[PDB]
């Protein structure tokens, strides 16, 4: 086994060894809830528990592409209701930024569309935005593909006018990979090389229920340690094995992503670095307001 003990401190010591050079992060909505952007599965607060008003056949229909193309108004109403007053990345995003700054980050595969990874300073090469982004939008006509910015989209969303393409009058959709849409080719290009050379998987803020993203946890070599930082266990059935007698590489830190990243950063000797990074960047954002 590569971990000396199945704890956060053991993962930290492994990350300080020379064997751990390439770290892949797999993140979901949980790493952004502390930024005011709700998740999907959490009781009461999750999006799937707050869609009775939109009168949908099933909660996921508001995020399914065929439903959107038939009835886009519920999605854009929900978007107006959820559009954040401020885009501030979390301590978890800035922990990934520290991984980048120290040359340890091979890739961040994110399921989120909030661009907080970019805002925290992760560059395009560092990112697999597996499910797209809200930042750009496109006409849904494949022979048109007129691109519209977040300003145009946000204006149409708050004026409660359904976004329509100025050239062919088709629907304009944010560049989110809705359910039923294919993931970008970059996902499948990166995975091929990334998961042959990964030394540590860091899974944060995801329930690991949406495919093909969840399957990524089984693409790593069997020796590669995997650390989950999440309010609840996830990815158990090559699934996650935290508790069995055969457990050897999977560690679950149950709690807030921000708290677990603070603790791991402190165990690595990065407490003050992460604090300064968060302070400076949140100040820069509050200044550019």
């Amino acid at each position: 086994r590569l971990l000396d003990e199945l704890t956060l401190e053991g993962v930290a010591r492994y990350m300080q060894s020379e064997r751990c050079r390439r770290v892949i992060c797999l993140v979901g909505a949980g790493i952004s809830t502390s930024a005011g952007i709700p998740d999907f599965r959490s009781p009461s607060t999750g999006l799937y528990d707050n869609l009775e008003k939109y009168h949908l056949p099933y909660p996921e229909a508001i995020f399914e592409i065929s439903y959107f193309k038939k009835h886009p108004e519920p999605f854009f109403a929900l978007a107006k209701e959820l559009y954040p007053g401020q885009f501030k990345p979390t301590i978890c995003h800035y922990f990934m930024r520290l991984l980048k700054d120290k040359g340890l980050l091979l890739r961040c595969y994110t399921q989120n569309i909030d661009t907080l990874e970019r805002i925290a300073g992760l560059e395009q090469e560092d990112l697999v935005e597996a499910h797209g982004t809200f930042y750009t939008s496109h006409c849904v006509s494949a022979s048109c593909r007129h691109e519209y910015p977040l300003s145009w989209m946000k204006e149409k969303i708050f004026s409660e006018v359904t976004p329509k393409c100025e050239d062919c009058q088709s629907l304009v959709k944010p560049d989110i990979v809705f359910f039923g849409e294919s993931l970008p080719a970059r996902f499948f290009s990166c995975m091929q090389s990334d998961f042959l050379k990964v030394d540590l998987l860091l899974v944060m803020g995801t329930s690991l229920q949406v495919q093909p993203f969840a399957s990524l946890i089984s693409k790593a070599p069997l020796s590669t340690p995997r650390l989950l930082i999440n309010k609840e266990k996830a990815g158990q059935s090559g699934g996650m094995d935290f508790d069995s007698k055969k457990a050897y590489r999977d560690v679950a830190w149950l709690g807030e992503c921000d708290q677990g990243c603070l603790a791991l950063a402190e165990l690595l000797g990065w407490k003050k670095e992460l604090e300064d990074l968060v302070r400076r960047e949140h100040a820069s954002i509050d200044a550019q307001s």
């Binding site: 359910f179 039923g180 849409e181 294919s182």
Partner: peptide, 8 residues
């Protein structure tokens, strides 16, 4: 016919 799709 297409690359793998986002599915719950």
């Amino acid at each position: 016919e297409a690359l793998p799709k986002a599915t719950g």
